[PDB]
Structure formats: C-alpha cells, structure tokens
C-alpha cells in the first residue's frame, strides 16, 4: 500500500482577457490512490457545469485528472479550485492567479 | 487495438 | 519521428459497495482516443478522438469484447492478490495495467510493454526483450511461474509486434492532421516582485505538442535544478500542453539568469533572457 499527495494547478487555457470566453482548468497529478474530489469555485461558490477527463496515469503509476469549465473572466471575479484526497488533512483551496 | 484475450490470471 | 500507443487500465475495489470499478483509456502519443468505464451505461468502448469515429461497427464490437474481458480478468486478479498477501477484504485495493508499443520514424516496431502495478507498486512486467518477466516479490513470482507455463510472453509479443503496430500505424494515418504534428512552444517570461529584496522570474512554454519538454534555469550558465520551481506539464484542454519554471532572483540580479527550452518543435534549443 502507498500514498502520494496530488500536485494541484488552477489555470486558464488561454492567457486571461477580461470579457473574452476561455476555459478554467484544475489539473491534479502525481496522486495515489485514485479517489479524489475537485470543485471549481467562482467567488467562493461551486461552479455547476464542470467536466473532467478519463482517469489515466503516468509512468510511475501516479494518477492525473483534468477538471474544466468554460468561463469568461472579468476584472473582479475570483476563481479557485478546491481539492480533497486521503493525503490531505482538509480540503485544499488554490486560488486562480492569472500569472500562476 | 486492445490486447486480445484470454488473460491468464495471477 | 517516433510514436507510441498505450492503454492504461485501473481497477479499484470497493468493499461493501459492489464490484470493483474498471476504467481503461487508450492513447496515441499524448492524444487520448478511447475509453471504457465499467460503471458507465453504454458498456461499450467509446470514442474520445475525432479520427477514431471512422472505425466501423466491427471495430467497436471487437474492442468492446477485448476490454470487457480484461475488466473481468482484473476483477479476478484483485481477489487473487488479496489471497496471496492475506489482506483484509475490508480495505480497498488498486490494480493498474499498462500495455502498448512504440514505432520508429519509419513505422517499424521499436519497443513493447505489458506491465501491472498493485497498490501503486510494480507487480510484474514483461522485460524489454519480450521473452521474460520481472517479478517484484514472492506473490508475483507465483504469477510469473504461471505465465511462463502458459506462454504469456510469446502471446503478448505476437500482439505487440503485430496487431499493436498495425493499429498504431493505421491511427497515425487516419489522424495524421492531429497526430503527426509538432506545435512548438510559445515562450515568454514574467516578473513578480515578492519583496524589495527578491522577485520571481517565471519562464513559460505554452501551446506545445507533444508533451515532452525540457525547461531549465541557469545562473551565470550554471545548474539551478535544486533552486528552480518546476511545475508538472499540464494540458491546456485543446490538445496542447503548458509548463513553467521559476527562480527567486535577488533584487537587481535578473540579468544573471537564462531560461533554456528544448522541444521537438524547436530546430535549436532556445535561450531566453530577461
């Protein structure tokens, strides 16, 4: 039996431009076991229309998943992803920084 | 193309 | 250049909540093309790339049969492993498999793979010579003996050198617009003050395909591997990939640093300076 913490990234598909349609991504990788929970947040609230990729894994057997939604960023709107996994003491919130 | 059967078990 | 086809399967038991879930995905290089999910309603191998949709009913019938067979075998393998290790039936366990082949720039067979991991650790793997097995522990040694007796190596070698290569070549032709492409990284650099004593220099690579890339920082032309934050290569969602590498720069020292980028789409490696 083993445990590996997810590496979490929240980011846009294209460089953010206010008023321009885009995609908001949360990529979780390097984790084990495979059960994981991801939400995308808009101003602290769960976004409803979020899809995810099919479960796959890397050469080291660690899993990766992409969660994504269409979004139109603005100046003031705040975005984040929230991730839970057995290796995390509590859900981890990572804020979207349009510069990473 | 997927690998053909049958799988020999562990 | 070279190309790969890979299938990745994951079986996860769920004690008290019915039978294990089985998920398999197929890839050509870094492009996914099929999936099967034992929990899904269709109970069919499903298309996940535009260029696989061309395949007729016989393909979907055959591939569905094969992946369903695998799902049942790994369900049995999970039970077998529990017994081998004398583990409690109360705990969830994971069985992963990877198989597939590589071809060279001419389309000739290059390498084959057929390997399992149990609870995230190597269990048994077909060696590069496609003639023998590597067994991780005593349990896997039992499996190795069974597979030797059953001539699994020869059967899988025949698949890997034959059908696997033929399929990969066919997909490469049918999806040539998507698969036989190189998107070079678009690169740039950003600067983020953290205090009046330090700032972050971040080097970006965006919109690249395939995913393989090397991004490094040097200071005065010297290695900075231990002092560089390097994020995992990530999908953009549009069939391209992204990555960045960052260093913490002391105030006024920006010009000592150079970012280096190597990718299949770059005829020469790039050197970037702030």
Residue numbers in the entry:
A (entry chain B): 0 to 99
B (entry chain C): 1 to 10
C (entry chain A): 1 to 274
Question: What sentences appear in the manuscript?
Answer:
Cytotoxic T lymphocytes (CTLs) are key players in the immune control of Human Immunodeficiency Virus 1 (HIV-1), as they recognize virally-derived peptide epitopes presented by HLA class I molecules on the infected cell surface. We reported previously that the substitution from tyrosine to phenylalanine (Y135F) at the 135th amino acid of the HIV-1 nef gene is frequently observed in patients with HLA-A*24:02, an HLA Class I allele expressed in ~70% of Japanese persons. Nef codon 135 is critical to both epitopes, as it represents the N-terminal anchor for the downstream epitope Nef134-10, and the C-terminal anchor for the upstream epitope Nef126-10. Our results indicate that Nef-Y135F, selected to escape recognition of a well-described HLA-A*24:02-restricted CTL epitope in this viral protein, results in the creation of another HLA-A*24:02 epitope immediately upstream.
In contrast, in context of the Nef126-10 epitope, the mutant Y135F peptide (representing position 10, the C-terminal anchor of this epitope), dramatically improved its binding to HLA-A*24:02. In order to examine the impact of these mutations on epitope structure, we solved the crystal structures of HLA-A24/Nef126-10(8I10F) and HLA-A24/Nef126-10(8T10F) at 1.66 Å and 2.0 Å resolution, respectively. Superposition of the Nef126-10(8I10F) and Nef126-10(8T10F) peptide structures showed almost similar backbone atoms, with root mean square deviation of 0.307 Å, but conformational differences were found at P6 (131P) and P9 (134R) residues. In addition, the B-factors for the central portions (P5-P7) of each peptide (41.5 Å2 for the Nef126-10(8I10F) and 46.2 Å2 for Nef126-10(8T10F)) were higher than for overall peptides (24.1 Å2 for Nef126-10(8I10F) and 33.2 Å2 for Nef126-10(8T10F)). These results indicated a flexibility of the central portion and P9 residue in both peptides, accounting for the structural difference observed. The side chains of P8-Ile and P8-Thr protruded from, rather than being buried within, the antigen-binding cleft of HLA-A*24:02, suggesting the P8 residue could be involved in the contact with TCR. The shorter side chain of T compared to I might make the Nef126-10(8T10F) less accessible to TCR than the Nef126-10(8I10F) epitope. Interestingly, Nef126-10(8I10F)-specific but not Nef126-10(8T10F)-specific responses were inversely correlated with pVL, suggesting that responses to the former, but not the latter, contribute to in vivo immune control. Nef126-10(8I10F)-specific CTL responses showed significantly higher avidities compared to those against Nef126-10(8T10F).
